[PDB]
Amino acid sequence: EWKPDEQGLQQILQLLKESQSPDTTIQRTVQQKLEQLNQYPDFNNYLIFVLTKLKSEDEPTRSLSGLILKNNVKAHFQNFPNGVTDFIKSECLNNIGDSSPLIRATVGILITTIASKGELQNWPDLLPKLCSLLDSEDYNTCEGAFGALQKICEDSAEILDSDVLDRPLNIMIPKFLQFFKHSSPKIRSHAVACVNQFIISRTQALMLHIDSFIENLFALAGDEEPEVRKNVCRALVMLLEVRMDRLLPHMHNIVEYMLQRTQDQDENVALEACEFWLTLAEQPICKDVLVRHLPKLIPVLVNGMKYSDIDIILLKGDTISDWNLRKCSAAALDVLANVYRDELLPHILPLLKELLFHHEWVVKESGILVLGAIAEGCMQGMIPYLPELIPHLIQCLSDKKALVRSITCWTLSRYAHWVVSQPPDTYLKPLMTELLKRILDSNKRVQEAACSAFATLEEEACTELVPYLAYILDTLVFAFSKYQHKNLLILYDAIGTLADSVGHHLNKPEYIQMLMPPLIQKWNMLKDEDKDLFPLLECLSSVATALQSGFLPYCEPVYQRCVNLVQKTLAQAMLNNAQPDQYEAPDKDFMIVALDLLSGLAEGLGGNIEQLVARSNILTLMYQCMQDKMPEVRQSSFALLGDLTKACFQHVKPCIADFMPILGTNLNPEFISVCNNATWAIGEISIQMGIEMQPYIPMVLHQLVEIINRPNTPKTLLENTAITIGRLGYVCPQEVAPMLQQFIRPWCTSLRNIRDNEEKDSAFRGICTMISVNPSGVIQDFIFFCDAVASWINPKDDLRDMFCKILHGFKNQVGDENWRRFSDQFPLPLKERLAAFYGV
């Protein structure tokens, strides 16, 4: 045995009487002393002892001892002596079925907690033991065992589905299935619960007994007990995902069952049922099985979307479940509408019609939500009703009730495509006017709704906002003074999305006047390692890009923090690479946006960036990122390099030696964006190095020729590849020119399709130079070059004379009669263009 010091046990029983004192400040100082005793080891032996052995005590006092012990298992189990432990473990299991339900709960919570903290392979007597106890003839022992087993399957499902314990599932699962039949409804619900853990993992023991499982489920269809029903519903939802086949046969039966449950009095059951419709809808067989029932279903869902009376109360002054019947029904409706398209409206529209206009607001509100939910897939079918509705909704933006104001903002944003595709004055103007008001609404929910809807609307509207710009910024900037936290974040989105939507139009001193100060104000106060510098980078990145050169005043502090972060990150990635156990791996998304913002300033400020580049190790850092193993990073640096190259090649040329070989290796089209931006940045440095490029040409060229001839490459890599070749041959024709016959054809084919611009120009100068040097590359495929030259509408004159000399050079080589015959295989527009423009 173990005996406790009776003189010291009367002591503990006092503490336990004081922990139950009403007086707040007694409780305060008594608990700090019970914390104190943890320091010493035997103490926990006194607790399990008060619980399980001292029947001369108050039950609340006993249960409290076990709960205190329990909490000492959560903190401080590494500090448990293995004798205290083993006394506890054994002492729990002898009383797992105590006659007192309060004690039995307490004992049970200990067991599951010890099993959870001090893992299962360290208590391997337990499962075996708990199984054998299910069979117990004593009911309370059975229930106890099963309650524990249940929490264990919940906590430890992956470990049980593992050799760690020698596949103990193979015995228990079939064992559990037996207990679906049991007298008690509690034992029935435990059994189903345990089993449901192992459905989605496709646990072997269960997949092989699937038919027992299903027959057994089906046999509980008609159970009065919510907790049983809840668990049946969970079971059927999961099955649906993994083992569609086995229950397809019985679908209609199942479906009628779920439809009942979806309406169940008890909202737990309801919600669990509702999940069905949602996960059913993602199943390619769905569309047929269900159609018969849409009639009955739609209104069950729609009726589920009203706020309850209690929902409403918690929303006056998030304060409510992030998942509930309302969201679930509503989400189901969105998926349905994307499957059934307009086939859905006959089942909905009439409901809408009387909900939207209904006089009680809760109902009108759910009307609006529905209308929002169906928007995406019922769009076409809704067009005819919108001229009535969109104006109706613009009205409700000023409704007395905020929950009507906010959902209205949302629903309007779902029809933003249509609104923007009309006369701006009928629908868009008054919409945008009311939104802008609501952005400054007194209520936080309405702000978030309104600001988000605005940002959404802005994306669809694009350049149509330029009239209202003045009015928009007034509102957005003023909102900085109101908004905090979650709504502030939506606001940066709103401003970012604005800049992206109008671009340069936003460059005007009066606009930059009001906008920039409060942003750079916010830029500083929020701290590196803050939740919110991520949305603010992306805000400034958008703005900076739209503002162009007008950004300049403001970019020192933005540059510095960007460089800082790129470094700070690589600092950590290093450590983590060498000592991964002690060092937190970094979050690269921080770096990727910084590089993208820096790349944004390089295009934007152009040359004026230069001096900040000089003062910083931006180039070393870039060097490091180009070898980074995540492709998004390599891609964001090559992008940056090409920009820096144009903006200020003088600070770059130093590092070229080192870069070109890295660029060389990254010309691999498996990762397209990197290959693209690498191809691009060698193009751009060609032009700045000119002739001095020639040492480096051997290390890239065969791979570029590789890529352009290599099929199923996206349009705009080839375009960049062609371009870049041209730009090499422009500055080192001697080395590039001999390769001409291999790339001339896909090169022409690819660039005959792009707009007369500066890249086209610089690349075609290239081809012309190489043709002068190896005039026999083109003679095989000369019609391809004719075609590409005829793609120019209005070329620079020098370039026009270059083509002119080539075209006639050839017509003279082959003679008039050969030429005429050659050009008869030209399409009219081309033949005539060349004959008129280059005189040929």
Binding site: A330, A331, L369, A373, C409, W410, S452, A455, D493
Partner: peptide, 7 residues
Amino acid sequence: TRFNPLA
């Protein structure tokens, strides 16, 4: 990260 009553 905008308002969405379906998620």
